[PDB]
Amino acid sequence: DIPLFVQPEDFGTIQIEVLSTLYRDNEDDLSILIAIIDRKSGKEMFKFSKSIHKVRELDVYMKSHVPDLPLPTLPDRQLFQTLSPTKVDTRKNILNQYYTSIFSVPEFPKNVGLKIAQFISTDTVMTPVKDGSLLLRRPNSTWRVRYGILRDDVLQLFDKNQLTETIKLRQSSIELIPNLPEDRFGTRNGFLITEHSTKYYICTETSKERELWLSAFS
């Protein structure tokens, strides 16, 4: 066997939270970061990372070994084709609904329950001023994944751990971009930083993350 972090009979005692679908794993590919939480304590026990391909693989296994029991539906493949903020926001919510339903099924067959347990017991992620994954556009205007670090009153953006942008907040102005009506770029949870000029369009994965980032800007 491979060591199990949570026994299949104890799937009911955990909550899941899909934290991101822009996480860079050990091989530096975009993957899905998932947190496993103890229900009674509310403490985050561990995190793990899976590519969308691995997610569909386990899904394929389940459809075939439990055909008679209803199972949730994965996000569509089109949500992972052209990178846009509105798709990133949506597919994270569907994945949250998906894995909440999985660990809410009362009983799985012994083989299927072990496979799910092995799934969450691999690709473990250990992670210990504001930061987070961001989506960046410039005024021929595609989006690109960036990792933002707020240093003092200066924002730093990295592309695969390489400084590609550096921003002064004292020189710049900030404004929210309304989610609606949806523009021709799929902007969502977005805001504009105009550094004195130059304009950077930045979106977060959730609307809460936009709230948290603006407060860091203050």
Residue numbers in the entry: 502 to 629, 636 to 646, 652 to 708, 716 to 737
From the reporting publication:
In this publication, we present the three-dimensional structure of the tandem PX-PH domains of the yeast protein Bem3.
In this study, we have determined the X-ray crystallographic structure of the interesting tandem PX-PH domain module of Bem3 to a resolution of 2.2 Å, showing that the putative membrane-binding regions of both domains are oriented in the same direction and thus might act synergistically in membrane recognition and binding. The crystal structure of the tandem PX-PH domains shows the well characterized folds of both protein domains. The model contains amino acids 502–629 belonging to the PX domain and 636–737 of the PH domain, but the linker region (amino acids 630–635) between the domains as well as the loops between β1PH and β2PH (amino acids 647–651) and β6PH and β7PH (amino acids 709–715) within the PH domain were flexible and could not be resolved. Strikingly, the PX domain of Bem3 contains basic residues (for example Lys551 and Arg592/Lys593) at similar positions compared with other PX domains, which have previously been termed basic motifs I and II, respectively, and have been shown to be involved in PIP binding. Specific point mutations introduced at this position in Slm1 and the PH domain of EFA6 resulted in mislocalization of the respective proteins, further signifying the role of this arginine in ligand binding. In line with these findings, an analysis involving the mutation of basic residues within the β1PH–β2PH loop of yeast Bem3 (R644S, R645S and K647D) showed that this abolished binding of the PH domain to PIP2, rendering the protein incapable of correctly localizing to the polar site at the cell membrane. In contrast to these mutations within the PH domain, a quadruple mutant involving amino acids within the so-called ‘membrane-interaction loop’ of the PX domain exhibits wild-type localization of Bem3. Although the critical residues Lys551 and Arg592 of basic motifs I and II of the Bem3 PX domain are conserved in the majority of PX domains, their role in the direct binding of PIPs has yet to be elucidated. The structure shows that the putative lipid-binding domains adopt a relative orientation that enables them to simultaneously bind to a membrane.
